[PDB]
Amino acid sequence: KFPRVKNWELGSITYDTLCAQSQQDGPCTPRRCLGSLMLPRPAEQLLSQARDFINQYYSSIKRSGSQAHEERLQEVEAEVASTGTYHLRESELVFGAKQAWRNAPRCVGRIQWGKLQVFDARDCSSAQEMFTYICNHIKYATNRGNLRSAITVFPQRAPGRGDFRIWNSQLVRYAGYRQQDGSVRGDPANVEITELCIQHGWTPGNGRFDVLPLLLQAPDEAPELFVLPPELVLEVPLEHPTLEWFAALGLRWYALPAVSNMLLEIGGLEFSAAPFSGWYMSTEIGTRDLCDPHRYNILEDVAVCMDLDTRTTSSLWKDKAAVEINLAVLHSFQLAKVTIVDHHAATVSFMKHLDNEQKARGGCPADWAWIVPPISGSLTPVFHQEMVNYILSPAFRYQPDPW
Amino acid sequence: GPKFPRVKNWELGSITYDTLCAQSQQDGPCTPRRCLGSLMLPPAEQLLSQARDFINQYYSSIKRSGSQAHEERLQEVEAEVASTGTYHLRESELVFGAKQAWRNAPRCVGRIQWGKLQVFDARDCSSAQEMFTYICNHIKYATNRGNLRSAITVFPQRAPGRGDFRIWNSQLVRYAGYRQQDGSVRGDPANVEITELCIQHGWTPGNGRFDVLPLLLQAPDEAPELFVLPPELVLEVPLEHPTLEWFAALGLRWYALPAVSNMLLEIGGLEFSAAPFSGWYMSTEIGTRDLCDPHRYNILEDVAVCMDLDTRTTSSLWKDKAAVEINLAVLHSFQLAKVTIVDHHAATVSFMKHLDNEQKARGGCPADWAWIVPPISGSLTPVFHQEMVNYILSPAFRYQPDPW
Ligand code: HEM
Ligand code: HEM
Ligand SMILES: Cc1cc(N)nc(CCc2cncc(CCc3cc(C)cc(N)n3)c2)c1
Ligand SMILES: Cc1cc(N)nc(CCc2cncc(CCc3cc(C)cc(N)n3)c2)c1
Ligand SMILES: C[C@H](O)[C@H](O)[C@H]1CNc2nc(N)[nH]c(=O)c2N1
Numbered sequence: 169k170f171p172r173v174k175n176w177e178l179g180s181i182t183y184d185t186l187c188a189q190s191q192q193d194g195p196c197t198p199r200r201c202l203g204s205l206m207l208p209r210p211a212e213q214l215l216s217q218a219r220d221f222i223n224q225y226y227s228s229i230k231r232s233g234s235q236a237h238e239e240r241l242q243e244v245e246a247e248v249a250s251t252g253t254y255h256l257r258e259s260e261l262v263f264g265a266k267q268a269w270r271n272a273p274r275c276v277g278r279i280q281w282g283k284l285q286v287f288d289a290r291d292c293s294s295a296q297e298m299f300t301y302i303c304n305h306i307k308y309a310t311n312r313g314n315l316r317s318a319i320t321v322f323p324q325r326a327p328g329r330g331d332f333r334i335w336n337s338q339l340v341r342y343a344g345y346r347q348q349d350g351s352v353r354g355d356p357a358n359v360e361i362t363e364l365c366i367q368h369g370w371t372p373g374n375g376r377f378d379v380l381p382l383l384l385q386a387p388d389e390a391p392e393l394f395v396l397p398p399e400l401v402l403e404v405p406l407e408h409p410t411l412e413w414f415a416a417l418g419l420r421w422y423a424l425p426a427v428s429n430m431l432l433e434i435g436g437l438e439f440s441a442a443p444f445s446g447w448y449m450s451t452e453i454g455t456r457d458l459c460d461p462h463r464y465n466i467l468e469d470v471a472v473c474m475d476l477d478t479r480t481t482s483s484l485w486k487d488k489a490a491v492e493i494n495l496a497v498l499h500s501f502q503l504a505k506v507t508i509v510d511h512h513a514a515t516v517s518f519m520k521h522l523d524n525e526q527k528a529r530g531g532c533p534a535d536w537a538w539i540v541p542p543i544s545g546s547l548t549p550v551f552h553q554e555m556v557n558y559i560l561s562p563a564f565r566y567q568p569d570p571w
Numbered sequence: 572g573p574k575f576p577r578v579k580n581w582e583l584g585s586i587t588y589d590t591l592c593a594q595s596q597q598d599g600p601c602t603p604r605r606c607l608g609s610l611m612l613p614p615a616e617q618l619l620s621q622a623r624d625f626i627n628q629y630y631s632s633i634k635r636s637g638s639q640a641h642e643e644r645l646q647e648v649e650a651e652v653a654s655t656g657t658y659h660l661r662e663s664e665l666v667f668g669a670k671q672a673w674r675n676a677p678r679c680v681g682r683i684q685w686g687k688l689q690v691f692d693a694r695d696c697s698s699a700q701e702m703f704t705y706i707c708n709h710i711k712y713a714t715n716r717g718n719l720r721s722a723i724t725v726f727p728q729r730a731p732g733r734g735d736f737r738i739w740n741s742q743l744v745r746y747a748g749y750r751q752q753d754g755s756v757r758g759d760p761a762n763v764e765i766t767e768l769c770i771q772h773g774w775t776p777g778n779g780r781f782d783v784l785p786l787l788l789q790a791p792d793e794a795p796e797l798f799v800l801p802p803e804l805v806l807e808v809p810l811e812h813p814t815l816e817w818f819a820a821l822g823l824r825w826y827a828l829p830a831v832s833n834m835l836l837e838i839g840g841l842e843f844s845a846a847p848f849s850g851w852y853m854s855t856e857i858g859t860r861d862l863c864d865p866h867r868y869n870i871l872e873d874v875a876v877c878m879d880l881d882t883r884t885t886s887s888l889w890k891d892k893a894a895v896e897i898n899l900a901v902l903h904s905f906q907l908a909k910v911t912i913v914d915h916h917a918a919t920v921s922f923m924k925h926l927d928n929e930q931k932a933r934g935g936c937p938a939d940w941a942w943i944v945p946p947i948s949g950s951l952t953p954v955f956h957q958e959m960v961n962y963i964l965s966p967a968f969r970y971q972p973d974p975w
């Protein structure tokens with residue numbers, strides 16, 4: 169009736185009771201599981217999400233049933249009944265943002281969930297103001313390499329007027345320039361956004377590591393272009409502890425992983441621009457960004473520099489080079505004194521988070537395929553851990569690209 | 572778009588729609604409210620409709636649907652059930668059904684080979700001694716001195732109130748695990764229980780790290796009987812590393828033949844409780860899981876110490892570096908010994924080819940993403956980037972409760 173969840177390394181068992189709090193359907197049915205798919209394919213409804221949320225908030229501060237709790241529910245009813253919508257109090261927004269992170273099933277970093285700096289940017293009325301808020305977020309989160317989790321929340325969606333949006337999917341990414349011969353210079357994942365930036369009048373570089381500008385959009389306005397001050401964008405040159413030639417590859421990556429395309433939903437309210445940042449787990453850079461064939465795709469280059477036999481899969485040249493590239497990321501971040509976490513440390517801390525959440529809430533939604541690192545899966549404890557995936561609210565959700 | 576799941580490959584950008592899932596007559600463990608895809612575990616009217624379905628599959632596969640022979644086989648099946656409560660497969664129906672069960676297996680990455688399976692028919696078997704002879708024959712044929720061949724042997728089906736044929740071992744070839752005075756295990760900790768059952772049934776145990784277990788074989792309504800595999804039948808590979816000379820000194824080894832013996836083969840509602848099957852290894856199975864799982868041989872630290880790695884800190888990636896080398900030792904050693912093996916790059920490339928064959932042949936392919944993606948270097952292989960749809964099609968292999 170409630171799922172049994174087993175750890176196959178330790179033989180331990182728990183039952184997930186939290187999943188019964190889910191109000192929103194995922195993509196699976198009893199006929200077929202779609203858990204590996206990356207994306208999904210009135211006033212009465214909003215009123216009940218708002219009440220549930222408010223009840224969640226008062227219970228978190230152990231004031232369920234208090235005067236303040238009753239009056240806050242009344243304010244919400246009154247506001248929705250007159251206007252079709254309502255507004256959160258700053259402390260509620262702060263609580264809601266932390267829960268959305270807590271509830272995010274694809275995030276291996278959730279042991280940190282209670283430590284989140286929340287910037288209230290709901291008094292934003294222009295793309296220019298958005299830029300200032302974003303620059304302040306970056307500065308704060310970066311903190312000369314001693315990275316601090318942060319979210320900045322721009323004004324909620326409103327009925328029949330356009331959304332505040334950040335067109336970039338990350339606050340910091342590298343340009344991808346489609347070339348004469350159909351190869352790509354830079355990050356092939358960012359060709360389409362790079363082309364939007366130029367079409368909105370950016371003067372592009374021609375390097376492999378050109379930091380993109382921001383396209384910021386205030387309601388029903390053309391997006392506006394803003395170049396990030398280069399001193400705000402902390403970057404780490406990549407070199408290798410023992411392989412002296414690695415540095416000559418001229419590789420580098422940015423310190424700050426900052427998501428800017430997801431929608432933050434709290435209490436039925438939607439925040440279409442609400443960028444958030446933490447710190448990197450080294451496999452995102454070392455394995456995916458640098459080694460994916462449709463990304464920087466450097467594996468063969470590295471393996472050749474290591475003089476490995478590239479002619480056959482069975483020499484395991486790919487595996488060997490992937491490991492050295494990940495080590496080089498860790499070492500370089502450590503050398504530059506910029507916060508990073510390796511995939512062993514991160515998954516061990518995630519296991520601890522599972523245990524905390526089990527006692528706190530009776531379960532924890534997790535997407536096994538996202539939680540298990542892209543190299544050395546079974547070498548980490550999360551591989552051997554069964555997981556239950558489901559949608560709780562508050563939530564981060566994916567949304568359509570604004571163009 | 573089409574009212575079927577849309578399946579995307581994120582490396583190549585290509586899209587397909589799975590229409591095959593519409594054929595699934597059995598529910599998995601997911602609902603709209605929660606995904607349970609990462610969990611390792613989960614009479615006349617019913618039988619007849621399963622039987623009719625399988626026979627339609629058989630006649631379809633030989634392109635004779637609606638044919639006079641098709642309707643006659645249907646009538647024959649219902650009459651058998653009508654008068655006996657059960658029915659029996661023709662020989663070519665069994666060959667087809669066994670290959671289809673393998674084809675349908677969502678967790679098997681080796682399915683490009685599905686059409687090439689030697690089906691040994693052992694539905695005449697009537698004793699544990701005879702099961703032993705059949706199993707020994709299978710092992711000999713399958714191993715083929717290192718040039719391995721996929722094979723399954725099918726013992727008589729489950730029958731109305733009569734005991735099952737069962738092999739108690741989960742695999743035909745496994746190593747003993749001996750519970751020690753100090754609570755540790757010598758050999759394979761996975762196999763403590765089966766090791767301890769073999770002893771209770773009179774096996775004289777060894778005390779190595781790599782002692783091949785005897786077989787505990789159960790004919791209908793008898794206690795299981797014990798059979799020692801003659802050692803010259805069990806091909807093993809000593810492990811060495813191509814450049815690390817000390818690796819051979821560790822005395823590690825593995826057996827050639829991966830042979831599952833505890834799974835139930837279901838075909839048209841008929842249940843084959845003993846139907847052991849075998850192929851050849853993918854190298855990560857041995858080098859990553861068998862040798863490096865913490866709860867298995869657990870050799871990662873020993874190998875990292877030999878490699879002189881910093882095992883005191885996670886960020887040295889000592890675990891990753893040791894695992895790679897062990898995996899390389901597995902591949903090198905099987906290649907040297909001329910024993911068929913496939914690495915995880917070549918296996919996953921071949922499974923991508925299989926997905927495209929099946930897209931055209933049947934409109935989809937049930938696959939379990941967590942099982943298909945290898946346990947090291949996942950995203951370096953093409954399957955990591957491929958969305959997959961998982962559902963139960965029959966014929967099927969299914970897990971069964973241990974007989975004890
Ligand atoms: C503090 C350090 C953090 C670490 C080490 C971390 C780790 C990760 C990793 C490795 C992923 C998978 C990323 C990928 O493969 O693309 C991820 C996903 C995610 N994390 Fe975190 N995280 C951190 C902080 C945060 C914060 C502050 C938030 C929000 C406040 C957050 C929310 C999310 C969400 C919503 C996803 C999924 C994004 C998507 O579906 O594309 N995480 N996390
Ligand atoms: C020809 C070479 C083959 C290769 C390389 C191969 C590969 C694999 C691998 C790597 C696994 C996962 C095992 C694990 O993680 O423990 C597996 C599972 C499986 N394979 Fe294959 N396979 C082959 C042949 C076969 C054959 C001949 C059959 C049956 C006729 C089969 C049916 C299955 C089934 C039913 C599973 C799931 C086992 C379970 O759930 O415990 N495969 N295969
Ligand atoms: C199709 C699709 C769906 C989906 N939900 N996400 C994506 C891309 C996800 C993605 C890509 N690059 C980068 C990130 C950033 C992930 C990230 C975020 C944070 C806050 C910390 C951290 N260590 N890592 C996320 C694609
Ligand atoms: C709880 C549980 C459930 C389940 N369905 N399977 C298992 C064990 C699966 C398992 C473990 N070791 C070994 C194998 C053999 C897998 C195997 C089988 C064949 C035929 C070829 C090949 N390369 N590999 C299978 C455990
Ligand atoms: C198809 C598959 O779901 C897709 O490649 C997923 C797999 N696991 C992942 N895991 C993480 N953390 N990030 C990813 O982008 C993906 N991609």
Ligand SMILES: C[C@H](O)[C@H](O)[C@H]1CNc2nc(N)[nH]c(=O)c2N1
Pocket residue numbers: 176551552553554555609610611941942943
């Ligand atoms: C918890 C999780 O489902 C479990 O550990 C799975 C993950 N993927 C696997 N994949 C394969 N091929 N074999 C396995 O035993 C497992 N174990």
Ligand SMILES: [Zn+2]
Pocket residue numbers: 196200201202203601605606607608
């Ligand atoms: Zn599912």
